[PDB]
């Protein structure tokens, strides 16, 4: 997954900035009806032209000159940036050390490289439907997390285009909470804690957290299908050798015994469960628990979190419907209403949306559908405004 020729990108942005951007809807979605003064003007942008010359201190008063300059330059990477304490483009006027970042929309990102600890379907630049099963399942848990135990309803979801998916939520006041709260929620959702260094990455303690209960109820509906259908992870020495090396040892030979007398990958896990029923997670009491087996399942499909992007007030990320030149693909709105019907391969690139319009507004092609999610969130905002 990438782009194949930067030759078209100049003219593509040339037309896009001209007549392919919800400058009305965007000015709205940012300024938020202008309910606050010096609200938009300090809401920052960062722009990146040829050779990736990324530059801070970018902002314009209202939609008109915003457009005019966007079309004057056509930046090739655009980050929305927190409303810092004062005038961004005139930052160096006040006494130094007095310009900082007050209030930021709360951001989240999850990578596909996250799953690379076991991901064997495709590469770091190439994908397939198998890994995308994760981009279909993981978001469900994270979404419903904020949908049922965080008292928010201003959620918005996008897939970057190459690896990550984004969530730029602008909740009533969370836009204006302390970095401490950021780190807090991060710590909260950071359940399976594993990169490429530690093996027993989940020392899940005894008593569960009902959050984890709903997590499980989601796991036993969407993991095993992908696992033993799209991968059949018990296929050769390679995969399960990246598996059995996190396990206690009293039975650690029976699993391989089931490994290499096989014509499928089902009775293996079946006898796994069986011996677990005769295994003792607790030598003390009669609570034979799914600690290790479900740690296995979850860790093999769990949203790996970032420890610095979901707390900092300096990392800025892309704009709604701003092109990712290095995939063609542009920001695709993602919804629970669409999680059951998404495919990454069919959704269009900048090249493809261009060839779409290369045939008045977004009101003709599938871009009006794609921004139905946008204007839907905006509708909710109208309902958010009293």
């Amino acid at each position: 997954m990438e782009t194949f020729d930067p030759t078209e990108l100049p003219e593509l942005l040339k037309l896009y900035y001209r007549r392919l951007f919800p400058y009305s809807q965007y000015y709205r979605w940012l300024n938020y009806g202008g309910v606050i003064k010096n609200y938009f003007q300090h809401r920052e942008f960062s722009f990146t032209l040829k050779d990736d010359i990324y530059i801070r201190y970018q902002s314009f008063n209202n939609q008109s000159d915003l457009e005019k300059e966007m079309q004057k330059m056509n930046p090739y990477k655009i980050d929305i940036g927190a409303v810092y304490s004062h005038r961004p483009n005139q930052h160096n006027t006040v006494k130094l050390g007095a310009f900082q970042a007050q209030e930021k929309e709360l951001v989240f990102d999850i990578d596909m490289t996250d799953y690379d600890d076991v991901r064997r379907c495709c590469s770091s630049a190439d994908i397939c439907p198998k890994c995308w099963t994760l981009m279909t399942m993981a978001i469900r848990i994270i979404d419903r997390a904020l949908k049922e135990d965080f008292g928010f309803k201003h959620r918005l979801w996008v897939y970057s285009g190459r690896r990550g998916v984004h969530c730029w939520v602008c909740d009533e006041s969370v836009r204006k909470l302390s970095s401490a709260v950021r780190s807090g929620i991060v710590e909260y959702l950071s359940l399976v804690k594993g990169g490429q260094d530690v093996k027993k990455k989940v020392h899940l303690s005894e008593k569960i957290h009902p959050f984890i209960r709903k997590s499980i109820n989601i796991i036993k509906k969407y993991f095993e299908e992908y696992a033993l259908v799209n991968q059949d992870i018990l296929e050769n020495k390679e995969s399960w050798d990246k598996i059995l090396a996190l396990v206690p040892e009293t039975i650690h030979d029976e699993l391989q015994q089931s490994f290499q007398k096989s014509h499928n990958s089902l009775q293996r896990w079946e006898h796994l469960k069986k011996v677990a029923s005769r295994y003792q997670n607790n030598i003390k009491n009669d609570k034979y628990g799914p600690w290790l087996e479900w740690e296995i399942m979850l860790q093999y499909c769990f949203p790996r979190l970032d420890i610095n992007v979901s707390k900092g007030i300096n990392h800025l990320l892309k704009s709604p419907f701003s092109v990712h030149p290095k995939t063609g693909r542009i920001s695709v709105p993602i919804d629970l209403q669409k999680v059951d019907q998404f495919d990454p391969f069919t959704v269009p690139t900048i090249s493809f949306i261009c060839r779409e319009l290369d045939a008045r507004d977004y009101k003709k092609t599938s871009l009006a559908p794609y921004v139905k999610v946008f204007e839907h969130f905006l509708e909710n905002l109208d309902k958010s405004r009293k």
């Binding site: 006494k95 130094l96 050390g97 007095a98």
Partner: protein, 141 residues
């Protein structure tokens, strides 16, 4: 007066008014006041010769950057201002211009064993450097 014998270590014979008529009636003691003034200026020079006021003040002004002719005259505003401005107007600011502790209850009482003297020479420049204070760097209001 006291300095005559502290650093300079000699005598200072002095004569009030009512003896000035005596010395009007005198050639030995009048001439003696004359040679006394001779020695006065002499010791006055010896002051410089020992304390080395001249090259000291000279080097200071050299590093100070302000009129030495207005240095000896006494001043701390000059030897700070006309120094700081050197750098501050390499930094393209614009400055304003001219117009018009803690005691610790000394616990008095004789002390017999040895006593030590701690000097906090270079305390304020020390603290200022240590904590990086500078005009531009405080929301001062």
């Amino acid at each position: 007066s006291e300095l005559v014998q502290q650093i300079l270590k000699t005598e200072r014979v002095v004569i009030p008014m009512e003896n000035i008529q005596n010395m009007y009636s005198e050639s030995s003691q009048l001439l003696y006041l004359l040679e006394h003034t001779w020695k006065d200026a002499k010791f006055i020079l010896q002051i410089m010769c020992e304390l080395n006021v001249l090259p000291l003040a000279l080097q200071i002004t050299n590093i100070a950057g302000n009129i030495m002719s207005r240095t000896l005259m006494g001043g701390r505003s000059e030897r700070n201002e006309f120094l700081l401005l050197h750098a501050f107007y390499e930094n393209n600011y614009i400055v304003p211009d001219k117009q018009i502790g803690l005691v610790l209850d000394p616990k008095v009482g004789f002390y017999d064993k040895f006593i030590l003297l701690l000097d906090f020479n270079s305390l304020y420049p020390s603290i200022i450097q240590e904590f990086n204070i500078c005009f531009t760097t405080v929301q001062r209001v």
